[PDB]
Amino acid sequence: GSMENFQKVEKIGEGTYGVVYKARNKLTGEVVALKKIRLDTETEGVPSTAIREISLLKELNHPNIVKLLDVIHTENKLYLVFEFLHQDLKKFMDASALTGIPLPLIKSYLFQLLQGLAFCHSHRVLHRDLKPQNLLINTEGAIKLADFGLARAFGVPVRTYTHEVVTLWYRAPEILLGCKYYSTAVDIWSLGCIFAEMVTRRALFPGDSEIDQLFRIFRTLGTPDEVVWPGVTSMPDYKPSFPKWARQDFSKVVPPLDEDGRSLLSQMLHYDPNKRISAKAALAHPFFQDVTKPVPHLR
Template sequence: MVDLSNYQRLEKVGEDSHKLYLVFEFLDLDLKRYMESIPAGVGLGADMIKRFMMQLVKGTAYCHAHRILHRDLKPQNLLINKEGTLKLADFGLARAFGVPLRAYTHEVVTLWYRAPEILLGGKQYSTGVDIWSIGCIFAEMVNRKPLFAGDSEIDQIFRIFRILGTPNEDIWPDVTYLPDFKPTFPKWSKKDLQQSVPSLDPAGVDLLEQMLIYDPAGRISAKRALLHEYFQEDPSQVPDYRQQQAVPLGATIYT
């Protein structure tokens, strides 16, 4: 039996006056609201991050195995129920992909979670765009703030470059042929990623590095990520997320 526990369930479909209505299951909150509900100075906890990451990667792997790109993975689109199950939601930008790679639109994925190949004007991309988004979400859970919080496309690009270094043909073949790549870009050197996520353990940093590889072809796949050392300890055995110091689940969280 297929396990669809990490997807928001479609309850029913209705039609009225030539309009189509989709009714989805209700979930208590999303990952963004959950992180905001935790008091300042209190982290999510390494075990809870691992639990959410496992579910996120597992859900994404299923999408990719069925040739679907989500294209808008971000904390607001990851819903959480009272049992601490994380579910992928909002497939409004999702697309099927095939071989050869199709040309897609440029304006996809919320800016902070947008892969560099899209930021640099690439029209052909694949599952790597979702993996990059997952890496950004991973770092955000660890730090309680976005890793690359740009306020424009060029600012977003430069924020990435300042941490990961300015890409070149040696580390990302054909990057200079992307429409929005400029040879005049400042030349930043790569920093030690551990400095950007100081509380993350070495296995977690290694997984994050593989998710944030510039060359999409070299980026780790969701399927391979599930086998990574970071997930060796079963995250389903970690404490219930309701034990975290967060807003009570019975409280009003939506306005």
């Protein structure tokens, strides 16, 4: 009877352990999204993905991170209550087929995504599943990070964590090659793949298997060697039989972009994770010298 003040409106989508509806608070008027977890079918108690998602999101309050409003623990169920946003970035790109997305809107969305990710990293959190489906937009020009069910708290210096994380098309080369240690640089590689996709409106590296994904990255950026990336020929899944492709001209990778734009994308896609740019340093890049906040055309 603890959900007495909410009225259901319509279903939004499906998920891992939970399913998601749009609802309305009958006393205040507030619109929300509700995620439900059944515990009846749970022979192991509260799931480890829900325990990480709630403990970490309570600590993260920022304008470009989606807000957790309440947790309700009645009966054989656990309900999570979130602020409501109107649409996802993957749906919005599909609807922009004919016009395309104007450059000042692209520049404002990237600047805002970099502010939210720097806040995560300064508070010792890795996200590990950045993709257009998990990024949400409203009618006043804002964009926000969502879905923290695959996230984790890290230490200084890191130790070995779960392998083969991140959806395949958005996954960094140090995870594909089996390296013992990974950190904050894996989330920057995913956002660079997303910047290219907003400009061309198709995925940059769409592979069907782990070896197919690696050979697509090599044909665009060149096969890496010891000069470009010290230590690379010693990694667990590196092989001496890999073909050897030449690196290509960046003006040909995303042809509509200007000189400042090409400079920033090449620093987000550096092979060596020690030399790859941080979210904090990227905020001062000259690409952002004339940034504003446009509203989008929705419906």
